[PDB]
């Protein structure tokens, strides 16, 4: 929440959004990568996962 709600939310709701530099997009793609892998792994086992992967509870 500290990233999307604080930074990217006020921009994309103004009808004339303009991101400053590409260095922000690449940073945001890394943060939004762990959350994608969690739902991808939950979408085939129908809820119960074994063994717990590194994306879920890292070392």
């Amino acid at each position, epitope marked *: 929440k500290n990233y999307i709600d*604080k*930074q*990217l939310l006020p921009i994309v*709701n103004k009808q*004339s*959004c*303009s991101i400053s530099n590409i260095e*922000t997009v690449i940073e945001f793609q890394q943060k939004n990568n762990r959350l994608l892998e969690i739902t991808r792994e939950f979408s085939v086992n129908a809820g119960v996962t074994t063994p717990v992967s590194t994306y879920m509870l890292t070392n």
Partner: antibody, heavy 123, light 105 residues
Framework: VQLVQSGAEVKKPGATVKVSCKISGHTLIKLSIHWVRQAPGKGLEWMGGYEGEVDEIFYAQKFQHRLTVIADTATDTVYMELGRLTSDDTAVYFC?????????????????WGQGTLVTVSS | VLTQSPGTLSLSPGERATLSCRASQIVSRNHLAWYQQKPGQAPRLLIFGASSRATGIPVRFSGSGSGTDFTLTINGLAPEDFAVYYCLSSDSSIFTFGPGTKVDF
């Protein structure tokens, strides 16, 4: 998505006028509205406005203590009042929604501007 | 206190046009926009942030500048963009327009 102005009218010096703004398409809890005056053939000048994001009102230094702007959030309307009206304020008034919301990633702005109406200070 | 130049210009259509905006005191690179308006109608917003185009304008328009100098240049000058070009600014939160330049011919 489009702003609508009040009706144009004639006026006499010494009185106080009222200008209204109706919003249809948004909630005004986020829109920032202002007021610009364009003279008949001259440039514009920012007079005052209400932001909504911070719920604050700013008035121009040259117009301070002469006007009061009240915006009803629930009734989605911002009211433009002008006290001590002289004979040289015969100009077209546009509302306009101009403002930059700078964050750590970029910039944000918009523009609707309504349609504007003219007020004439006759004898 | 913003001053525009070269006042009035009357260059032929189809040639690039240069407009300048100077600031008496230093302003941010952001908090600056260019408005072109034909008389009697609602002004449109050309660029915001002094280097970023708006939503729904041709690729021809482009603006740059930093410090107390800001320049707007248009490469293709169609007969549908002859108007007065204002240069809005805001130091902290106060908006102050400019005298305005008019593109003729």
């Amino acid at each position: 998505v489009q702003l609508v102005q009040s009706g144009a009218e004639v006026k006499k010096p010494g009185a106080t006028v009222k200008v209204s703004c109706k919003i249809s398409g948004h909630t005004l809890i986020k829109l920032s509205i202002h007021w610009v005056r364009q003279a008949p053939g001259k440039g514009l000048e920012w007079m005052g406005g209400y932001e909504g994001e911070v719920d604050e009102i700013f008035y121009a230094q040259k117009f301070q203590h002469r006007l009061t702007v009240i915006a009803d959030t629930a009734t989605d309307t911002v009211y433009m009042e002008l006290g001590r009206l002289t004979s040289d304020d015969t100009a077209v008034y546009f509302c306009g929604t101009l403002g930059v919301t700078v964050t750590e990633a970029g910039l944000g702005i918009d523009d609707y501007w309504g349609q504007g109406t003219l007020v004439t200070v006759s004898s | 206190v913003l001053t525009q130049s070269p006042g009035t210009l009357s260059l032929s259509p189809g040639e690039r046009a240069t407009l300048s905006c100077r600031a008496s005191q230093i302003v941010s690179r952001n908090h600056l926009a260019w408005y072109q308006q034909k008389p009697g109608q609602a002004p449109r917003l050309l660029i915001f942030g002094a280097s970023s185009r708006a939503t729904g304008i041709p690729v021809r328009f482009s603006g740059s500048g930093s410090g107390t100098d800001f320049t707007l240049t248009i490469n293709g000058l169609a007969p549908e963009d002859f108007a007065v070009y204002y240069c809005l600014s805001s130091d902290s939160s106060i908006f102050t327009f400019g005298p305005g330049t008019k593109v003729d011919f």
